[PDB]
Amino acid sequence: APRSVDWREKGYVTPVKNQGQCGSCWAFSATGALEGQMFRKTGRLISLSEQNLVDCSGPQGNEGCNGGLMDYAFQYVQDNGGLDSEESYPYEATEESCKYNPKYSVANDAGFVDIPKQEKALMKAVATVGPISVAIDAGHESFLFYKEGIYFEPDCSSEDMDHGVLVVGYGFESTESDNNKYWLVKNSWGEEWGMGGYVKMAKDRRNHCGIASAASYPTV
Ligand SMILES: Cc1ccc(S(=O)(=O)N[C@@H](Cc2ccccc2)C(=O)CO)cc1
Ligand SMILES: *CC(=O)[C@H](Cc1ccccc1)NS(=O)(=O)c1ccc(C)cc1
Secondary structure, eight states: OOSOEEGGGGTOOOOOOBOTTSSOHHHHHHHHHHHHHHHHHHSOOOOBOHHHHHHHOGGGTOOGGGOOOHHHHHHHHHHHTOEEBTTTSOOOSSOOOOOOOGGGEEEOOSOEEEOOSOHHHHHHHHHHTOOEEEEEOOOSHHHHTOOSSEEOOTTOOSSOOOEEEEEEEEEEOOOTTSOOEEEEEEOSBOTTSTBTTEEEEEOSSSSGGGTTTSOEEEOO
């Protein structure tokens, strides 16, 4: 695998979005992964509707602003035969009745692939597939105030993740502790959080915060 990957340089990644006060992280992770795979197929980057997932993917097991799983969203796009664009079905940060309209659907998938719970396997998927949906333990003040550098939280759990996000690459930079490797992660808290909405999360530090315990991507 390469030592460094950044799919934003290849056109796979929309700008950072903001989920607001709705527990819809899982929807932003899923649209990020599907936005990348759709671009890989068609060469056109189109922002996808998180509200469409929040309002409509209940039958697959999602619970709107109360939580959900990226895999369930991928299952919805497959079952439903499509997913509306962000512009056609904009984000309201509140759960409402499903307003899906297939005339405005711009994405499809035929399932999803769950990545083995290994950072080595996650690296190979990021290097060969595109942005990857992952879940992390974001439940620490240190994560809220992250600003730069490689994020490392000693109290981070590798088993109880609460926050779905998107791995868009990985890389390295020299650090005091010589733990130099990171995952490049797109968050959904707007661009004022972190590094323009991104975080460099510790890579190859024993599945730090569980980043490799629930990684997946849709099949397009
Ligand atoms: C109290 C609470 C409220 C909402 C959520 S969440 O649904 O927004 N976050 C997801 C993230 C996730 C975790 C593992 C695998 C995929 C996605 C979950 O933890 C799902 O159970 C979690 C906790
Ligand atoms: C992933 C998501 O949408 C979360 C849902 C959540 C998770 C834990 C506790 C309350 C709500 N929303 S979030 O704003 O991304 C977030 C809030 C709090 C924590 C500890 C993590 C993430």
